[PDB]
Design an enzyme around this catalytic site. Structure first.
Site, short mmCIF file in Angstrom:
data_model
loop_
_atom_site.label_atom_id
_atom_site.label_comp_id
_atom_site.label_asym_id
_atom_site.label_seq_id
_atom_site.Cartn_x
_atom_site.Cartn_y
_atom_site.Cartn_z
CB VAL A 87 -1.05 0.05 1.29
CG1 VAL A 87 -1.62 1.26 1.23
CG2 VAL A 87 -1.74 -1.03 1.32
N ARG A 108 14.19 -2.86 2.32
CA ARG A 108 13.12 -2.60 1.46
C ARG A 108 12.79 -1.13 1.05
CG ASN A 141 -7.22 -2.86 6.72
OD1 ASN A 141 -6.71 -3.16 5.52
ND2 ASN A 141 -8.45 -1.89 6.86
CG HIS A 149 -12.28 0.29 5.28
ND1 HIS A 149 -12.82 0.21 3.97
CD2 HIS A 149 -11.23 -0.11 5.14
CE1 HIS A 149 -11.99 -0.19 3.18
NE2 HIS A 149 -10.84 -0.50 3.65
#
Lengths: 282, 281, 279, 274
Positions: B11, B37, B110, B163
């Site tokens: 994301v 990363r 989330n 959501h």
């Protein structure tokens, strides 16, 4: 995506500049009776193209409109009435030259009076989509001012300016909307002032060629990208017997459909009086 | 205009890509616990910059977020995800507030709603917002517009509340070209009924391109102080939880909230949605 | 302007995302054996298009490539690796030529060089191009520009030859602000040495970089930009497909510009070409 | 990102139009003695704003330049100095940190003047930026390649006396002549003479060029532009290639010219001292 503009007066060249800085098309041809002017504008606008999306720009005669998807007709020349019949003469000369080279191009008429000249251009070019810039910019101003007063970005404002481009045009307050509510209702919920004075103010505001330049480019982009944008462009409107600005879905083939708004008796009245003015001159 | 994104999972890096491709900002910092990363995604995204507007991309520690106008926090049983993810937040949010105390914190992990609540308390005195239902609201509009035969900008409609599976589609306020959606379908003689609506409802409730791009839209709203109406998640006192409603967003974050007028049923469904979140909370 | 991307792995979908978000084309089709993936990524990417220039995005079968200006072939699964993708290509390319006989065909699968050769065979009478060293050339420039402290447009340089470890950095022609890089570094009194240059060579040799590169090649064709890109195409002087700088437009490669190399660089190049001559 | 323009003549509003169309900045103030003009164009331009960048545009006075990162001064030299002497200090008053971008002619000396009136502030003139861009565009056009693959500088005094550095002109990393030879395209004193004319010659090009200079500042890009600045090896303000960023000119790249090239340059330098 190739676009031509005929008549490199201020509107044509501001539109051409807007098209270029925006990367709306990959070829742009300027075509004018005063070749030199056309030459100079083309070469000046060339050295502007956006790296991320360049545009071949050049000037030429009508034959260069070959394969244009859109041709923007800005050519134009004391009573509104002899502006009208000077330009009608110019149009009778040009439009057939345009149709000869670009028979399939969408014709975007901008000269004043735009409504009546769009009617003329339509008859001079029966087998081609013909569209007038009409009230597109004014609808854009109407929305911009409402949004400005509502304290929200312009995409959240909805509203149309209808009818004849000019003093006669109608602001469809009845259908004005912000964030999905009728404007009055949005203003109330936000405790913002709304009344006849504020609206009257906006009314004077709704009513340089940068605004129109940008607008002409958006109409053009709507076509170039088969976009079905709702734009209050001018077209022959059989209910009224004249070319008029109503909201129309616009895409590659031009006007795909026309959605007449539900107006108040008073708005519908102004609109028909507007149409009367145009009927006469016609 | 500087942006930092914390946690370079899919994301975060998809958002970053979107930011750079559109030239949303001139400065972009990737910050991750996995500093290799981060550096890879930063050196790779760095290449995608558009000439007509460049962006300086690099990776760093939390100190590198200094002066960022927006920080996108993407680092991350539901109840397991949640507490596992709350711990991470209690570690990171303070490091973020250390480095950029006046930047807008955009939470996307989330569960986004509860984690927006958590973040708001870990970082008081700083605008905090969760991505919430922004993408879902956009799909909802896109699907109506596609069915109406018109460009998406002429569609209006919100997805409200939690959501997820519990979010509410505010049909009652869905609008196309200035009309209620059904009235527009009636005017164009296009089919509109329960099954058409249930099919759109499926497409609205569903690779992170959709969310990456939305993340950039919210960010741009802040960077340019644009006063965009977005259904982002913020603490909503009327419900005692953070959930999504339409909010005017600009440089200082949420400037105001527009509570929509819902049908009884919708309001009912929204309150149940709030109950669920109070339940985890 | 319509583009179809075939095989919706990471490269294709990242390429599609880049195309959409920059508004590179109006019309975009994703085509994959795995029609579920294609549909998913198409629906997602559609939600990601900037309002100014919109793009209609969808999934479909090969017949949907109808009227594509560019088709980006990204489908892919060493001699074995090569023999598997060749099989896939022999199946797909003709389907593509079927539906989009006049599309420019942009091959990215690995090995890009040999597969561009294959696709050229499979699709004669149609421009065929491989992404080759386009990204690499871009990194090479970016890294010099970053060391010189000037925007990347003011760096010039090519990575030539075989996509991979064997590729050649044409140092001998590297340029910053119109000077040879060494001369620029000295003028600005910055360090330039074998250790700086090997660190660049390192960064030069996720799929965001290639995605954006694929978009740039595609935009060159769509807009007829006459861009100089080091893409891969059959190069008769070497008897294989190879990256050299080429002027790329609406009809694909309009001409090849063979760079002047040092004897050492020309060697590495011909060595590079020798390998490929094997496959 | 905040930009203001002082003087809304043609060069000013065409530059602003270009800024707004490309979404180069988010805020744009027009400042002008003729406040009525400044008011519509702010209003007209209000509008060319793309949705997904987008810009707040308005009119106002010098106080309204507050927090500007760039101020484009577009508001003969005799007169134009009396004007600078009134405005530049008003600008420095409100926007002390703004980069001052001087464009009025003569831009070279009017840049030297502005540098005088506004020390402790980055000051540069548009100089030969547009002309260096024409120069490259025309070579590229003749070469059959995109403009980015052309390299070339126009140096010195903006106007009749400027020097095309044919000696360093480059296409695809080669000397233009060597490229035309490889491409089998005609290159001969006549072709160059034609380019020369077009190069050194309506305000679209300058508008776009001003916007690109502004973006180099706003986005701290380190762009190489032939802008005019005081040049201490000539004692005057001159166009040379300079790295430009958020803090204005970060460095100056003195190009290696032929004797005949450096000839015209130094020549023009003096024609400047007055």
């Amino acid at each position: 995506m190739k676009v031509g503009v005929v008549g490199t007066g201020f509107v044509g060249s501001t539109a051409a500049f807007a098209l270029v800085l925006r990367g709306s098309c990959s070829e742009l041809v300027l075509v004018d009776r005063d070749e030199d002017r056309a030459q100079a504008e083309a070469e000046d606008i060339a050295h502007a193209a956006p790296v991320s999306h360049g545009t071949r720009v050049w000037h030429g005669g009508h034959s260069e409109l070959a394969d244009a998807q859109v041709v923007i007709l800005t050519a134009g020349a004391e009573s509104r009435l002899d502006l009208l019949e000077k330009n009608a003469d110019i149009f009778r000369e040009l439009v057939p030259q345009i149709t000869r080279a670009a028979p399939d191009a969408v014709l975007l008429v901008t000269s004043n009076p735009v409504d009546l000249l769009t009617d003329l251009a339509t008859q001079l070019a029966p087998g081609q989509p013909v569209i007038g810039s009409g009230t597109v910019l004014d609808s854009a101003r109407f929305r911009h001012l409402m949004a400005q007063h509502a304290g929200v970005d312009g995409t959240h404002a909805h509203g149309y300016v209808l009818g004849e481009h000019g003093d006669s045009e109608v602001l469809a307050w009845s259908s004005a909307m912000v964030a999905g509510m009728p404007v009055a209702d949005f203003m109330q919920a936000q405790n913002l002032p709304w009344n006849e004075q504020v609206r009257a103010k906006i009314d004077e505001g709704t009513r340089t060629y940068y605004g129109i330049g940008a607008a002409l480019a958006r109409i053009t982009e709507a076509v170039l990208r088969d976009r079905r944008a709702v734009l209050t462009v001018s077209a022959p409107t059989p209910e009224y017997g004249v070319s008029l600005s109503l909201p129309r879905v616009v895409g590659r083939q031009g006007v795909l459909s026309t959605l007449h708004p539900k107006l108040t008796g008073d708005e519908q009245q102004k609109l028909e009086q507007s149409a009367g003015v145009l009927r006469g001159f016609k």
